[PDB]
Amino acid sequence: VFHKIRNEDLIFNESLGQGTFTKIFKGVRREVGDYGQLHETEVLLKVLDKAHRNYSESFFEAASMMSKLSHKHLVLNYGVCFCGDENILVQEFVKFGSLDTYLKKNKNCINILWKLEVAKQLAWAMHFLEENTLIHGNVCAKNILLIREEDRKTGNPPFIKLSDPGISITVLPKDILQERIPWVPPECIENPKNLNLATDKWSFGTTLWEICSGGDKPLSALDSQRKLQFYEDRHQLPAPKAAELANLINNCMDYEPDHRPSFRAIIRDLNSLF
Ligand SMILES: Nc1nc(Nc2ccc(S(N)(=O)=O)cc2)nn1C(=O)c1c(F)cccc1F
């Protein structure tokens, strides 16, 4: 159960747009921290409309279930504000933000080893979720958050965390799931009850394509109807700009869910590319 945070201890400072039936803000939390030290902590606030009851329930159950699993590559949730007409997730603010935006702002001037390190970290996170039989369901480059940039002097790689799952595809409207092709796998377009650990293996492939494509979105030129037909016709994505991961992407984006490799196997594959 999430720690409750009082509306009175939250300041909203900056609008950061919208997620899927969410409004996102940067703000500050006034808290009592380690040793009774008063802190003013930068926070990321995700606001759900209480009137969208099934969406909110799904969102906060997903966030809660994953926050029960502390992990270096999973975002820290501080708690929730049940304040009136809205329920608010209070989350750590990750300094360098979403990986797709990061790659655009840096004009894809990162080398293949940087991409491999981020891919490995994501794979380790997903391996941990797989061992805990916890489906994420919204793996994508925008939900990869950069804590730290690479430091060439120390050899430190970039360091990432994976965002909270959001509203489950089992409750979202079909048109939203179709918009989310090709992150949502074909079996889930067919029936959202086909959600399975296999789902995240497919989406991991799509996310690798993003990482290797400088933050481009695959199939952006296709509308919801032509994306649904892209699966009906069983097409695969084009090889990304950095072709080094093309084989791994194809192996993960397997139309047969049971053939998608384990994240343990995926990690070994990534290691062998170096
Ligand atoms: N927890 C979290 N921290 C951030 N850091 C952030 C956000 C925006 C910027 S900006 N306006 O480009 O300069 C810079 C740093 N994002 N974040 C999220 O969960 C998050 C997400 F996963 C997807 C989309 C939006 C988010 F907000």
Author numbering: 536 to 809
What does the paper say about this structure?
The TSA screens identified six compounds that induced shift in the unfolding temperature of recombinant JAK2 JH2 V617F at or above 2 °C, four of which were identified from collection screened only by TSA and two, JNJ-7706621 (1) and AT9283 (2), from collections screened by TSA and FP. JNJ-7706621 (1) and AT-9283 (2) were also observed as JAK2 JH2 binders in a previous screening by Puleo and coworkers. The initial hits 1 and 2 possessed highly JH1-selective binding over JH2 on JAK2, whereas JH1-selectivity of 7 was minor. Compounds 1, 2, and 7 also inhibited viability of MPN model cell lines HEL and SET-2, both of which express JAK2 V617F (homozygous in HEL, heterozygous in SET-2), and murine pro-B cells Ba/F3 carrying either hJAK2 wildtype or V617F at submicromolar-micromolar range. Structural analysis of compound binding modes to JAK2 JH2 WT and V617F mutant revealed no major differences in the binding modes with the exception of compound 1. 1 interacts with the side chain of Ser698 in the WT structure but in V617F structure this serine assumes two conformations and instead of interacting with the serine, 1 forms a hydrogen bond with Lys581, which is shifted closer to the compound. In addition, 1 forms an H-bond with the side chain of Lys640 from the αD helix. This interaction is also not present in the WT structure. Differences observed in the complexes with 1 stem from the conformation of the Gln626, the αD lysine and differences at the back of the binding pocket. The variation in the hydrogen bonding pattern in the back of the pocket (Ser698 in WT vs. Lys581 in V617F) might reflect differences in the dynamics of the pocket between the structures but altogether the differences in hydrogen bonding with 1 is not reflected on IC50 values.
